[PDB]
Write a protein that binds this ligand. Structure first.
Ligand SMILES: [Mg+2]
Ligand SMILES: [Mg+2]
Ligand SMILES: [Mg+2]
Ligand SMILES: [Mg+2]
Ligand SMILES: [Mg+2]
Ligand SMILES: [Mg+2]
Ligand SMILES: [Mg+2]
Ligand SMILES: [Mg+2]
Ligand SMILES: [Mg+2]
Ligand SMILES: [Mg+2]
Ligand SMILES: [Mg+2]
Ligand SMILES: [Mg+2]
Ligand SMILES: [Mg+2]
Ligand SMILES: [Mg+2]
Ligand SMILES: [Mg+2]
Ligand SMILES: [Mg+2]
Ligand SMILES: [Mg+2]
Ligand SMILES: [Mg+2]
Ligand SMILES: [Mg+2]
Ligand SMILES: [Mg+2]
Ligand SMILES: [Mg+2]
Ligand SMILES: [Mg+2]
Ligand SMILES: [Mg+2]
Ligand SMILES: [Mg+2]
Ligand SMILES: [Mg+2]
Ligand SMILES: [Mg+2]
Ligand SMILES: [Mg+2]
Ligand SMILES: [Mg+2]
Ligand SMILES: [Mg+2]
Ligand SMILES: [Mg+2]
Ligand SMILES: [Mg+2]
Ligand SMILES: [Mg+2]
Ligand SMILES: [Mg+2]
Ligand SMILES: [Mg+2]
Ligand SMILES: [Mg+2]
Ligand SMILES: [Mg+2]
Ligand SMILES: [Mg+2]
Ligand SMILES: [Mg+2]
Ligand SMILES: [Mg+2]
Ligand SMILES: [Mg+2]
Ligand SMILES: [Mg+2]
Ligand SMILES: [Mg+2]
Ligand SMILES: [Mg+2]
Ligand SMILES: [Mg+2]
Ligand SMILES: [Mg+2]
Ligand SMILES: [Mg+2]
Ligand SMILES: [Mg+2]
Ligand SMILES: [Mg+2]
Lengths: 48, 109, 136, 63, 48, 63
RNA sequence: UCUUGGUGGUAGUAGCAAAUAUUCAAAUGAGAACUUUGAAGACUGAAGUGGGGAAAGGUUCCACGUCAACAGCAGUUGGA
RNA sequence: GAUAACCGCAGCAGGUCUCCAAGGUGAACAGCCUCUAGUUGAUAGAAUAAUGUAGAUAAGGGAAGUCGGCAAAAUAGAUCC
RNA sequence: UGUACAACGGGGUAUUGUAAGCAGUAGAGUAGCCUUGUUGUUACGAUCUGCUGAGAUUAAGCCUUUGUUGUCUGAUUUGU
């Protein structure tokens, strides 16, 4: 916890996220979900 | 356990020679194959076939293959065996591709 | 930076140290601008004062009208070409470095800007936005 | 939070990703990565680059 | 665990980017619940 | 053993270099008894020393 | 800053890093990174790390035996 | 006849006169790769801190560095203008 | 002797940019066959098209794993 009570207007700001990035950090990711990846790329050769 | 056994393994030499000096990739492939065979057979004395040495050195000093299929047989050391009475001797296996192959026990029949 | 600009500016990445020759984007007659100074610049040993988009610089005219050359006049950097970040996450840049000749309170010497103008510059300087066409 | 389009490759640009380029004649080119940025700088045609959306639409892949 | 990035609206009156979207790096700390196993008593002494 | 003298003698007998002289590794004991050029000649006849054919420099790509 | 001889500390230390590069087996041996042979990999690339000579050296050539010293690691090898 | 047989205190990256001279690229006895022939000798093994030596790359600016563009980069062959 | 760990294998993620092979009524054309087509033939032919966002690589300091095969008592020292 904060050791002092901060009233600096950068604190006391109620944050609401609009979006969280979930693309791959193991490269330059392009897709947020595998469903998005499948919708962009269509169907590949990989076995069903 | 049971002493003499012949198995086939695939060694990933790509991950074992990642970042190695170019004039040392094939000597360190020889030494990683010995390290691999000591890990899998429990034998400090590993002998490598010169066919395996040709297979390692096939594309020169820095062109070691990413994957070798090795037959390693653990054997009985004869004519005044050393601190370990077993030795492990490593052959190459002539395969079309060294990918998608699991470890298999070669039976002696 | 200094006096004349209307508003604060977020920190844009510095692209233009002193000695940089940037294009002259107005129709004052000058073809380029040699940056000799940056307004509102901190004191640090060995650091070249470096201009950024929307900054007021002091500049000389190397190529241009004989009435414009051999003088120190204020200019305002309108195009950067060093890639800078906006707080909305965008990293952006132009092809060229460009600026417009201005007076010490930021009224423009020319009256028309060729090419685009950075939005940070147009919000910092109202006469630059007045004489600018497309902005980013 | 407007998802943009790669100008070279047609990939989707989420916020913070890639680079924006204002060409000197004031046309905006958005790139999802430095691959698209570099092949734009190299004057490559997207119609001849086999993995781009504009290649695949012209060569009629994936319908 | 590592970082990701977010988009959120800004509630900062007087900022130029008031009520617009900003992209912010965030660190994700993976926090499973802690198990309480002990208690320790501490007396104040002239040595601490 | 030490077959250095036999490889030098075998090169001089068959008329090639020492890089082109093959000695039988399984017949080292009776190679080592060949201290004379006549004995080297006899091992060349019985195939214990082999002329070890030339390394090819093909001119097909040149042609 | 004596002379000659001997010995320390520094100190098992500085170093033994130019000339692309070695590796597997067998043999020999008490003992093999270094010897021999096979195998593979490389290099000099014909103004050569090849084949000969001039000066100089003087037996270094070659074989057999052999490793105390010498080959600034080793040595079963050697211009020892 | 020399990165060990010569001189340099030595088996020293120095120095020391000459002959012969394959294929390809290419103007070329350049550089690069190969054939014949020769060698694979130079203490090794493990790890990959700082600082080095040698080799590099670098956004935006482009000599603002420094006594001085020192070092590096840029240019490069050929054909036509 | 484990909801173990390892080595392989599988999947995901990622990078590159469409592998080899086969086929083609694609190919600037040139050279042969004529019982001369008219989307005849034979030889050579950069490249192109389909199978093919394929193939390759992927932890070496990426993620995951109900798969296969292994491994799991060597040594030394310590007492108020
Ligand atoms: Mg990452
Ligand atoms: Mg295996
Ligand atoms: Mg590395
Ligand atoms: Mg090499
Ligand atoms: Mg299998
Ligand atoms: Mg200061
Ligand atoms: Mg003047
Ligand atoms: Mg004779
Ligand atoms: Mg004295
Ligand atoms: Mg004295
Ligand atoms: Mg002493
Ligand atoms: Mg010592
Ligand atoms: Mg030392
Ligand atoms: Mg040194
Ligand atoms: Mg060296
Ligand atoms: Mg041996
Ligand atoms: Mg060694
Ligand atoms: Mg080999
Ligand atoms: Mg070479
Ligand atoms: Mg001799
Ligand atoms: Mg001896
Ligand atoms: Mg010695
Ligand atoms: Mg000794
Ligand atoms: Mg020796
Ligand atoms: Mg000797
Ligand atoms: Mg001599
Ligand atoms: Mg001297
Ligand atoms: Mg010398
Ligand atoms: Mg000498
Ligand atoms: Mg040449
Ligand atoms: Mg040759
Ligand atoms: Mg050395
Ligand atoms: Mg730079
Ligand atoms: Mg640049
Ligand atoms: Mg310039
Ligand atoms: Mg100047
Ligand atoms: Mg100066
Ligand atoms: Mg100065
Ligand atoms: Mg001067
Ligand atoms: Mg100098
Ligand atoms: Mg210079
Ligand atoms: Mg000309
Ligand atoms: Mg394709
Ligand atoms: Mg490919
Ligand atoms: Mg193909
Ligand atoms: Mg793979
Ligand atoms: Mg994992
Ligand atoms: Mg099992």
């Amino acid at each position: 916890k904060s050791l002092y009570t901060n009233t600096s207007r950068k604190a006391l700001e109620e944050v609401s996220l609009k979006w969280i990035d979930t693309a791959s950090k193991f490269g330059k990711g392009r897709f947020q979900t595998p469903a998005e990846k499948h919708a962009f790329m269509g169907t590949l050769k990989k076995d069903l | 356990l049971k002493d003499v056994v012949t198995r086939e393994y695939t060694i990933n030499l790509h991950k074992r020679l990642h970042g190695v000096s170019f004039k040392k990739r094939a000597p360190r492939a020889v030494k990683e194959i010995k390290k691999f065979a000591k890990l899998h057979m429990g034998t400090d004395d590993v002998r490598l076939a010169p066919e395996l040495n040709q297979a390692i050195w096939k594309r020169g000093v820095k062109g070691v293959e990413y994957r070798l299929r090795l037959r390693i047989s653990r054997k009985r050391n004869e004519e005044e065996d050393a601190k370990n009475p077993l030795f492990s001797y490593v052959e190459p296996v002539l395969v079309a591709s060294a990918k998608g192959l699991q470890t298999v026990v070669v039976e002696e029949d | 930076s200094g006096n004349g600009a209307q508003g604060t500016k977020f920190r844009i990445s510095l692209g233009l140290p002193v000695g940089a020759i940037m294009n002259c984007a107005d129709n004052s007659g000058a073809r380029n601008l040699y940056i000799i100074a940056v307004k509102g610049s901190g004191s640090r040993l060995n650091r070249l004062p470096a201009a950024s988009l929307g900054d007021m610089v002091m500049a000389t005219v190397k190529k241009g009208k004989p009435e414009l050359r051999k003088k120190v006049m204020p200019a305002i950097v309108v195009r950067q070409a060093k890639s800078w970040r906006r707080r909305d996450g965008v990293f952006l840049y132009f092809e060229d470095n460009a600026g417009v000749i201005a007076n010490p309170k930021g009224e423009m010497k020319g009256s028309a800007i060729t090419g685009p103008v950075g939005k940070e510059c147009a919000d910092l300087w109202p006469r630059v936005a007045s004489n600018s066409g497309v902005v980013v | 939070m407007k998802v943009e389009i790669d100008s070279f490759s047609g990939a989707k640009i989420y916020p913070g990703r890639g680079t924006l380029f204002v060409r000197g004649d004031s046309k905006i080119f958005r790139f999802q990565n430095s691959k698209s940025a570099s092949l734009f700088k190299q004057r490559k045609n997207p119609r001849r680059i086999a993995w781009t959306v504009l290649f695949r639409k012209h060569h009629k892949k994936g319908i | 665990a590592g970082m990701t990035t977010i988009v959120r609206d800004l509630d900062r009156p007087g900022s130029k980017f008031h009520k617009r979207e900003v992209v912010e790096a965030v660190t994700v700390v993976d926090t499973p619940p802690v198990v309480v196993v002990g208690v320790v008593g501490y007396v104040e002494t002239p040595r601490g | 053993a030490n077959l250095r003298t036999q490889k030098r003698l075998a090169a001089s007998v068959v008329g090639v270099g020492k890089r082109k002289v093959w000695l039988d590794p399984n017949e080292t004991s009776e190679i080592a008894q060949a201290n004379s050029r006549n004995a080297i000649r006899k091992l060349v006849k019985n195939g214990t020393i082999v002329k070890k054919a030339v390394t090819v420099h093909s001119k097909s790509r040149t042609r």
